[PDB]
Design an enzyme around this catalytic site. Structure first.
Site, PDB file in Angstrom:
ATOM      1  N   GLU A  71      47.171 -19.720 -17.498  1.00  0.00           N
ATOM      2  CA  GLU A  71      46.564 -18.445 -17.161  1.00  0.00           C
ATOM      3  C   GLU A  71      46.690 -18.144 -15.681  1.00  0.00           C
ATOM      4  OE1 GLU A  71      42.780 -17.280 -19.262  1.00  0.00           O
ATOM      5  OE2 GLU A  71      42.804 -19.420 -19.727  1.00  0.00           O
ATOM      6  N   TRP A 115      36.391 -22.018 -20.103  1.00  0.00           N
ATOM      7  CA  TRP A 115      37.135 -22.634 -18.998  1.00  0.00           C
ATOM      8  C   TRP A 115      38.620 -22.324 -19.147  1.00  0.00           C
ATOM      9  CZ3 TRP A 115      34.084 -25.680 -22.268  1.00  0.00           C
ATOM     10  CH2 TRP A 115      34.780 -26.257 -23.346  1.00  0.00           C
ATOM     11  N   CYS A 155      42.167 -15.608 -28.928  1.00  0.00           N
ATOM     12  CA  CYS A 155      41.678 -16.783 -28.226  1.00  0.00           C
ATOM     13  C   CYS A 155      42.244 -18.082 -28.785  1.00  0.00           C
ATOM     14  CB  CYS A 155      40.154 -16.813 -28.308  1.00  0.00           C
ATOM     15  SG  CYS A 155      39.512 -18.116 -27.290  1.00  0.00           S
TER      16      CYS A 155
HETATM   17  C1  HEM Z   1      36.230 -22.792 -23.919  1.00  0.00           C
HETATM   18  C2  HEM Z   1      37.408 -22.438 -23.334  1.00  0.00           C
HETATM   19  C3  HEM Z   1      38.229 -21.336 -23.660  1.00  0.00           C
HETATM   20  C4  HEM Z   1      39.575 -21.334 -23.481  1.00  0.00           C
HETATM   21  C5  HEM Z   1      40.395 -22.516 -22.939  1.00  0.00           C
HETATM   22  C6  HEM Z   1      40.072 -20.066 -23.944  1.00  0.00           C
HETATM   23  C7  HEM Z   1      41.361 -19.635 -23.719  1.00  0.00           C
HETATM   24  C8  HEM Z   1      41.834 -18.344 -23.919  1.00  0.00           C
HETATM   25  C9  HEM Z   1      43.106 -17.864 -23.436  1.00  0.00           C
HETATM   26  C10 HEM Z   1      44.241 -18.647 -22.765  1.00  0.00           C
HETATM   27  C11 HEM Z   1      43.142 -16.544 -23.674  1.00  0.00           C
HETATM   28  C12 HEM Z   1      44.203 -15.585 -23.129  1.00  0.00           C
HETATM   29  C13 HEM Z   1      43.615 -14.891 -21.912  1.00  0.00           C
HETATM   30  C14 HEM Z   1      44.513 -13.801 -21.371  1.00  0.00           C
HETATM   31  O1  HEM Z   1      45.741 -13.926 -21.526  1.00  0.00           O
HETATM   32  O2  HEM Z   1      43.991 -12.832 -20.777  1.00  0.00           O
HETATM   33  C15 HEM Z   1      41.942 -16.217 -24.397  1.00  0.00           C
HETATM   34  C16 HEM Z   1      41.670 -14.984 -24.982  1.00  0.00           C
HETATM   35  C17 HEM Z   1      40.404 -14.654 -25.534  1.00  0.00           C
HETATM   36  N1  HEM Z   1      39.290 -15.475 -25.559  1.00  0.00           N
HETATM   37 FE1  HEM Z   1      39.196 -17.431 -25.213  1.00  0.00          FE
HETATM   38  N2  HEM Z   1      39.054 -19.279 -24.460  1.00  0.00           N
HETATM   39  C18 HEM Z   1      37.910 -20.046 -24.255  1.00  0.00           C
HETATM   40  C19 HEM Z   1      36.603 -19.525 -24.364  1.00  0.00           C
HETATM   41  C20 HEM Z   1      36.264 -18.248 -24.792  1.00  0.00           C
HETATM   42  C21 HEM Z   1      34.900 -17.850 -25.031  1.00  0.00           C
HETATM   43  C22 HEM Z   1      33.652 -18.689 -24.663  1.00  0.00           C
HETATM   44  C23 HEM Z   1      34.980 -16.623 -25.678  1.00  0.00           C
HETATM   45  C24 HEM Z   1      33.939 -15.798 -26.121  1.00  0.00           C
HETATM   46  C25 HEM Z   1      32.698 -16.224 -26.450  1.00  0.00           C
HETATM   47  C26 HEM Z   1      36.392 -16.289 -25.775  1.00  0.00           C
HETATM   48  C27 HEM Z   1      36.897 -15.027 -26.126  1.00  0.00           C
HETATM   49  C28 HEM Z   1      38.240 -14.623 -25.963  1.00  0.00           C
HETATM   50  C29 HEM Z   1      38.718 -13.277 -26.192  1.00  0.00           C
HETATM   51  C30 HEM Z   1      37.956 -12.054 -26.725  1.00  0.00           C
HETATM   52  C31 HEM Z   1      40.037 -13.326 -25.918  1.00  0.00           C
HETATM   53  C32 HEM Z   1      40.990 -12.162 -25.907  1.00  0.00           C
HETATM   54  C33 HEM Z   1      40.641 -11.197 -24.793  1.00  0.00           C
HETATM   55  C34 HEM Z   1      41.580 -10.029 -24.751  1.00  0.00           C
HETATM   56  O3  HEM Z   1      41.897  -9.497 -25.830  1.00  0.00           O
HETATM   57  O4  HEM Z   1      41.992  -9.638 -23.646  1.00  0.00           O
HETATM   58  N3  HEM Z   1      37.188 -17.307 -25.243  1.00  0.00           N
HETATM   59  N4  HEM Z   1      41.081 -17.321 -24.481  1.00  0.00           N
HETATM   60  C1  LIG Z   2      35.878 -16.247 -21.493  1.00  0.00           C
HETATM   61  C2  LIG Z   2      36.876 -16.857 -20.508  1.00  0.00           C
HETATM   62  S1  LIG Z   2      37.979 -17.997 -21.380  1.00  0.00           S
HETATM   63  C3  LIG Z   2      39.612 -18.064 -20.604  1.00  0.00           C
HETATM   64  N1  LIG Z   2      40.166 -19.231 -20.353  1.00  0.00           N
HETATM   65  N2  LIG Z   2      40.320 -16.970 -20.270  1.00  0.00           N
HETATM   66  C4  LIG Z   2      40.233 -15.627 -20.568  1.00  0.00           C
HETATM   67  C5  LIG Z   2      40.629 -14.706 -19.561  1.00  0.00           C
HETATM   68  C6  LIG Z   2      40.560 -13.292 -19.803  1.00  0.00           C
HETATM   69  C7  LIG Z   2      40.097 -12.794 -21.051  1.00  0.00           C
HETATM   70  C8  LIG Z   2      39.699 -13.699 -22.053  1.00  0.00           C
HETATM   71  C9  LIG Z   2      39.763 -15.093 -21.829  1.00  0.00           C
END
Ligand code: HEM
Ligand SMILES: CCS/C(N)=N\c1ccccc1
Ligand code: HEM
Ligand SMILES: C[C@H](O)[C@H](O)[C@H]1CNc2nc(N)[nH]c(=O)c2N1
Ligand SMILES: C[C@H](O)[C@H](O)[C@H]1CNc2nc(N)[nH]c(=O)c2N1
Ligand SMILES: CCS/C(N)=N\c1ccccc1
Ligand SMILES: [Zn+2]
Lengths: 407, 410
Positions: free
Chosen positions: A283, A278, A106
């Protein structure tokens, strides 16, 4: 052993010690690196529980206190009796936030502590799950001014009474295999879209149809539900200079909400824990829209841009890709729906990474996932060395429900 | 054992067995991955097994494993090592080794060309002037008037580590960087430290934005000597845009031949500290990294400004927009002057095909995802969706300490 991480753009060197507290295995060895591979009991429960509790109490400056000691004993006895235990509200909240804090993939973890936790542990039915989910979606969407959140359903017991949200995300578009052999809608959901139909859902066969929720409670079979259309905020995609862009007939939802992962806290597993934040522009603009296996819209956009698509050396794909991402961000910003671009998100992660090093002594990070799928080297994270390792509480992958459910 | 690798855009799955022959460490453990970390003499007892391994490989490739020629070669090498402590490679073995060091470079996206490499045997060289002549010939041959040809020149291997041959330049052809008391930098910031060493050693810096640096050559362990590469031998390309007439006014240009000269080549335990090698540029190396890296020329603002882009907020993607044009310009120019160059789409697509081919005839293809994926448009190239396996195989090209930090001046 102390490990150092250098940013080659600023030369800043941070020192990592936090990795010493790693638990799981990375999948790599001294002989082979798998950094790019997408996915490499009572006696078991108490140690994990103890580890977590020690973490929790040390974080609240009460490490060892009678409180700490009491709780530890309490859980121990509970596990010996109920062969498991229940987290206290405070520990649930802490665990959730820290699973996010520890998500090495993330890029937006700077917001980790600002997470709204909804305790749904008292839920018992799929209708109940739908109710909790709807409120989550409404609270999180907040009329465009998005707010991070997570809803936690009952933890796993015997594995046969598992709560699960069959959708990968609370909001996603349908995908259907048409006569032509082609794909209508989102190819990434084609299967799920089927299971929904195979359940009773009346598919509209459209390019952007919002799928229904398939909620599973207590190991029971999943039921379908339609998210109140008023609760699904969507954004029509238009360009700030191409009035023809509106003719591509594109749109996307504003709330990214992961619902197919598993949350682990103190050894306890919560198989149904939808969480949302968000979008980072890329993405949608790069992955959902331009990925070959997804909506694969580069061709069209290129055509309408009237540019030589004869030779790759013209970089017409790169040309298109950009405008498209200009249009995503533009649309979101215009309708006042929260969204962040790769430049700000990555810069923010660097700051966060810098705070995490002096406050935690480290920050697990998966370079391969952190670096945006476009303009990599012009974002800061590209020049930042990272150390990847697993820390609990954590969010983990889990087998698709339909691939293991006993109907 | 076997290891599966998957491409999430085709669902193509490959099986890897080649990694079973990996010996050296990767820097990663079972509890930590250092995949994004830039960079985490021999005794006779350590030398023979290395020679044997290599020779068994060489002979197996020519389909003569176990033959008498093979057996006697091991006998000859073993004896040579015991009496001289080292051993000399045969021309055939040297050529085979060089190609394989390239073939095993997991960070190289252009390995599809690995077998087509011209090897120049410079093991009879004894002085810096000697190295200069050898290097000029390599440059001329490789440049070929713009129709580039891959090549490597190999100088004497290491002996006691006190008589190393070294090319102090990181690349045979590079632009000087000068730090002004102003605090600003003129030319290429990445070559400032080396530029200084040259000036100190006697180079008369023209103090311009694109001054081809002189060669600093160290032969047989002696102090390094300065030499200027014949200007008519240095092919350069003026950068202009196909549609932006003002682009040419940016005063940009780059050399056509990328030739690494600071790496170490290892063949059967032997170490070649001076082995300059060259191929041809992938567009993004100049257009993205050399021109747009903040610590390099950093021309994003000037290109964006002249393109009249909304530079008020990053969310307008002015940087991304300008980056594409800058890369448009590099490719266009090189092509207009008929100087070989490949774009990231062609290069990465070819790599995928090369990779699959390596899995089917070699049992694998070590690859470093972090370096293989281009610095721009990452996911719109096939390598992005390709799982890769990184491990070390010899022969190999290794990093080595900068000569100026270890050299014992005479
Ligand atoms: C607040 C805004 C947030 C942004 C802008 C953000 C952005 C991102 C982005 C760009 C990715 C890549 C997604 C993909 O390529 O599928 C990601 C992965 C991840 N995010 Fe965040 N995130 C945010 C919030 C969250 C929240 C609230 C959680 C959990 C409480 C979280 C958990 C994760 C996890 C577990 C991954 C990896 C998922 C996987 O392995 O497929 N994110 N996030
Ligand atoms: C928790 C939505 S936060 C986000 N921006 N994107 C995701 C999309 C797929 C997997 C994890 C993050
Ligand atoms: C024919 C044209 C070739 C192309 C298009 C190609 C392309 C590239 C590119 C883009 C990189 C990354 C460079 C960087 O980011 O600094 C690279 C890395 C590498 N290439 Fe190639 N290459 C070619 C020929 C060669 C040759 C002839 C050799 C060896 C004989 C070679 C050895 C390597 C090595 C060792 C690396 C990694 C360098 C490092 O670790 O710093 N390449 N190549
Ligand atoms: C094969 C490779 O691991 C795969 O394409 C990864 C690379 N980096 C990624 N990064 C993010 N953020 N999201 C992804 O889905 C991927 N896919
Ligand atoms: C920190 C990170 O490893 C570093 O910025 C790497 C990433 N990938 C790269 N890839 C290539 N080809 N060249 C580089 O210099 C780098 N730099
Ligand atoms: C051997 C020139 S082949 C090439 N395209 N570029 C490189 C630049 C720096 C290091 C390695 C390769
Ligand atoms: Zn690793």
């Amino acid at each position: 052993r102390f490990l150092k991480v250098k940013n080659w753009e600023t030369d800043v060197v941070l020192t990592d010690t936090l990795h010493l507290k790693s638990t799981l295995e990375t999948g790599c060895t001294e002989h082979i690196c798998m950094g790019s591979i997408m996915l490499p009991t009572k006696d078991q429960l108490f140690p994990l529980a103890k580890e977590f509790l020690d973490q929790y109490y040390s974080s609240i400056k009460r490490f060892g206190s009678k409180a700490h000691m009491d709780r530890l004993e309490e859980v121990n006895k509970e596990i010996e009796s109920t062969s498991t235990y229940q987290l206290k509200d405070t520990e649930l909240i802490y665990g959730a936030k820290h699973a996010w804090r520890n998500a090495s993939r993330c890029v937006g973890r700077i917001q980790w502590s600002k997470l709204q936790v909804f305790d749904a542990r008292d839920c018992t039915t799929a209708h109940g799950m739908f109710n909790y989910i709807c409120n989550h979606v409404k609270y999180a969407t907040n009329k465009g001014n998005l707010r991070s959140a997570i809803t936690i359903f009952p933890q796993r017991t015997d594995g046969k009474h598992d709560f699960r949200v069959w959708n990968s995300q609370l909001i996603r578009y349908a995908g259907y295999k048409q006569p032509d052999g082609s794909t209508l809608g989102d190819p990434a959901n084609v299967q799920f879209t089927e299971i929904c139909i195979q359940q009773g859902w009346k598919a509209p066969r459209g390019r952007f149809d919002v799928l229904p929720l398939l909620l599973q409670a207590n190991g029971n079979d999943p039921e379908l539900f339609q998210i109140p259309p008023e609760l699904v905020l969507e954004v029509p995609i238009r360009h700030p200079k191409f009035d023809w862009f509106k003719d591509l007939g594109l749109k996307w939802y504003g709330l990214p909400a992961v619902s197919n992962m598993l949350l682990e806290i103190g050894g306890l597993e919560f198989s149904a824990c939808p969480f949302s934040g968000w979008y980072m522009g890329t993405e949608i603009g790069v992955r959902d829209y331009c990925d070959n296996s997804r909506y694969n819209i580069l061709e069209e956009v290129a055509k309408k841009m009237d540019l030589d698509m004869r030779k790759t050396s013209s970089l017409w794909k790169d040309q298109a890709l950009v405008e498209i991402n200009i249009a995503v961000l533009y649309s979101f910003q215009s309708d006042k729906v929260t969204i962040v671009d790769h430049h700000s998100a990555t810069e923010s992660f660097i700051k966060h990474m810098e705070n995490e090093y002096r406050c935690r002594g480290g920050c697990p990070a998966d370079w391969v996932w952190i670096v945006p799928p476009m303009s990599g080297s012009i974002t800061p994270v590209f020049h930042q060395e990272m150390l990847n390792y697993r820390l609990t509480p954590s969010f983990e992958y889990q087998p698709d429900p339909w691939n293991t459910h006993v109907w």
